[PDB]
Design a binder for this molecule. Structure first.
Ligand SMILES: [Cl-]
Ligand SMILES: [Cl-]
Lengths: 249, 249, 249, 249, 249
């Protein structure tokens, strides 16, 4: 879809323009801790869409059918059934396959990833620890999903079903993963990316892109931090450029 | 009995008038950690009744026979044996069949629903989490009741009795539910409805109506907010109209 | 329905004739650690029916619809869904209301009694400890049912529902028991009756009749023993006659 | 496949001929308690196949690839990955989809049934308690599978995935069951069928046929018992004929 | 090192000759609740060596340095530090790298396999359940080792050390296994092989050979049975030939 890029969380049109100028592959509209966290007001989403030409994403509460249907009616590119917001259903997720708009979901293991894909998700990402600035949770989630997938690619067929039963995964999804040799969708790194070295590390661990952001607007030079993150996600093994960019922050 | 409507909590005559002008099917008279919560003063109920022509409802403490009989003598349309008030009897509910006025009660599963119906309740609603603005508990209760009813409609006869024994439901009530194919009374959504998307979501889950709290008057434009809630409860699948209405809140 | 009588377990035509001559109100056809206990062969039931003019009863495994339907097609008077046989369904009993022949079931408390009645049982009896000769369990079950019924007859209405919820009884059945002032069906004593004093004691506790096992034919004079059991079940307070009859055993 | 019939376990050519004369839809070749229970000698299977024209089945140890491949090379119609035999793999079942011969497996719940179907089973049956003559286990397994399937046919889509996760079932199998309205394969009753009334009961509970046998050869008139079981499996609601046939055993 | 062969347990010269005539790649000298199991008498080992030209193996107690050194001085080809004998050291195994003769050891997982290899073992085999005739434990051990090796071959480098730390394996041994892509020594199947189908199944699971116990001589035709075992271990996918050979046993 949009592999190799950086996704930023914007709060107005100015931050969206700064993101487009920095080289972000997509934007995420959002309005922070306390109370109930619901979807953003449609005016903010419409402003974010009118501000940039890059695809704009919006978050919806888990299991909230109406929020996702409203974001779909608005013409949003992708919808993020985000656990960042206060969930709406603590038992059942959205049946994203019944939707026209593609969906991105969070996961921490191959079981969660397979359950989200079977529910109709088009894109995946790590849950991480959003708002903490700590990359350890995203690292753990990425490494767990990748190790389980590597096991599944070289697992004996006779042992696949049991494996699913042990991790709560749909059998057909695991068979598809084994036949294709990798995840059928892209898996991004989200929650915890604070420095461009964090984005480079997540891309070195085998991520298909960086999803976290929001904090880039808090720096003394927000545009500089955004450009540094975007340039560190791409060509993540050029350490000299990474150090040079980090020196100017 | 008047399914598909919106019921609002009012505290004075002005709120009752505003709710009537918004298009609410009925009103609920209320007074206000909060100490002991009892029934409202009869003067406030009389004011609410004289303010609007729509049916007026009043809350009574659980198991408080005298409060309910007084509200019946006052001429209220429906009485809510509401757990939101400090209960008066923590072991037995009132014998609603021995009353002349209809009753609405809260429930979280088919067992509680059947226990309330067997006692003579004329209406049901989810308990939810009142005052929290989170529709999680209402969603959970509605889904649980709907799932147990779906079980009961297509269940073998030999397995009905034990089912009642396992859920504390009256046997004849469960047999009637199986024979009719649905609940004998309407089931509304209550506690947690914060946005028009929440009302549309509760109606999408199969509710027969929504109960709005006092937060509807907390908006900058309470009249517009109440109108949006009403217009979203009706035609709950028109997601474009829901998004348009929410853009103005 | 024929209250105050004695029911005897017979295995052939001679035993049925001897029980008829003793004055038993009905007979029970039987075949025999004992492996699996199923219904008796239809030939033995037909022999028992052709041997005596009194009503003949046959036992069926719990939840075994086919055994009960076969016994109904054979023309049996009553069917005993007896736990003394190896049960066929350990979760659900047969829907006795959907049958044409009346049923007698075992019970140890008002909850089991009400569950059996709600399923359509026409008669009740204590489970006891069959084959032990000890009337302890029959006494216990009879006293428990009588105590719970005495509670229910003089209990407040508001406390009925919870009571059902606490004992697994159908609400309408408990309401009917409260309104009528007694059990809707007769309750017999079964399992443990060894001496005529045991039958007189079960009748003193408020039973509507006694079920005699196979030990009645184990005496040196089986006819005299059966006659003593019958003469003690009737006029159970004539202690001098009971002692006289027991002196000859 | 072969719905409505009775399957018998034969040990030689004479019992297979008696089964074919009785009206069995298929035969099961077998050679009993103690030690290790493996597949039968190929000579016995070849004799059973040469004795009758009805399809012949053979049992293989669970997870034993070579035993099933040998039975497939022999030209056996169906293979029974039977838990009756001492298992060969206590973790992983055979991938029956990779086979040409159709497979029949045992199950006790919708989870096991879905795991067996996803593994490539063409036919199902209850595990029961083989060799005990007690129908209670088959009754429990049949009722559990049927109740879970009835739930699944009327379950909300948004709740399906979670349901699978709760029972360890493949998501696609459950979706297929919901879309078709029933199990995609036939579900037979096995283990415990001792009397023709047991077969009639299993068919009244919603089974697609009777699978248990073996014991029919132990009666005084084995041919008579076999004919009675075959006639009771078909037209299971003719209770008069069932009683007549049972009277002659 | 001589992969794909069959190793047989012999007790005299006649058994060694019969095993050689059957086509076994090597022989195992043995003597016999059974008290204490020690190494065999040197006279029996010398007899077995003089009887056949194939390589002869002898078992030694675990950690018994002197037994192994004596067997080395006797001129044995391979030594089996077999747990089937009563161990002499329950804490430490012998330093096989300090010996001149090659060693074969038992294992149940990659941890035990790596611990044995690091100590200098030249060959591996499953522990199984010797004397039971049940291939369950051999299947389990083989599948566990194969699964852990499949994990290790496609595992990230950063995750290797911890993996060793979590399984008690030497780090350099695991690195060598990852670099070579397979085990550094052959892994045989042992303990539980009862039928030629069992040998074919162990070879299908990826074993490098089978260890036959003493039951091969318990058949009515021991020579035919041993020939069938050998002919099934080789070309283990020719299921028609396996069935034909088994038909004669
Ligand atoms: Cl917070
Ligand atoms: Cl045994």
């Amino acid at each position: 879809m949009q592999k190799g890029g950086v996704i930023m969380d914007v709060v107005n049109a100015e931050q969206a323009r700064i993101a487009e100028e920095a080289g972000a592959v997509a934007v995420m509209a959002l309005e922070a801790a306390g109370g109930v966290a619901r979807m953003a007001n449609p005016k903010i989403v419409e402003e974010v869409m009118n501000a940039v030409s890059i695809p704009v994403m919006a978050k919806a509460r888990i299991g909230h059918i109406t929020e996702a249907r409203v974001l779909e009616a608005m013409g949003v590119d992708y919808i993020d059934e985000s656990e960042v917001l206060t969930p709406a259903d603590e038992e059942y997720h959205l049946r994203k396959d019944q939707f026209t708009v593609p969906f991105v979901c969070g996961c921490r293991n191959l079981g969660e990833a397979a359950r989200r894909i079977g529910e109709g998700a088009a894109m995946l990402r790590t849950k991480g620890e959003p708002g903490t600035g700590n990359i350890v949770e995203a690292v753990r989630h990425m490494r767990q999903v990748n190790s389980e997938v590597s096991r599944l690619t070289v697992m004996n067929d006779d042992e696949i079903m049991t494996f699913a039963k042990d991790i709560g995964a749909p059998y057909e999804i695991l068979k598809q993963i084994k036949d294709n040799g990798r995840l059928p969708v892209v898996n991004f790194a989200a929650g915890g990316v604070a420095t461009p070295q964090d984005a480079a590390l997540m891309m070195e661990l085998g991520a298909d892109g960086v999803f976290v952001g929001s904090g880039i607007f808090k720096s003394e030079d927000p545009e500089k931090f955004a450009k540094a993150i975007v340039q560190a996600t791409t060509h993540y093994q050029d350490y000299e450029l990474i150090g040079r960019l980090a020196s100017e922050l």
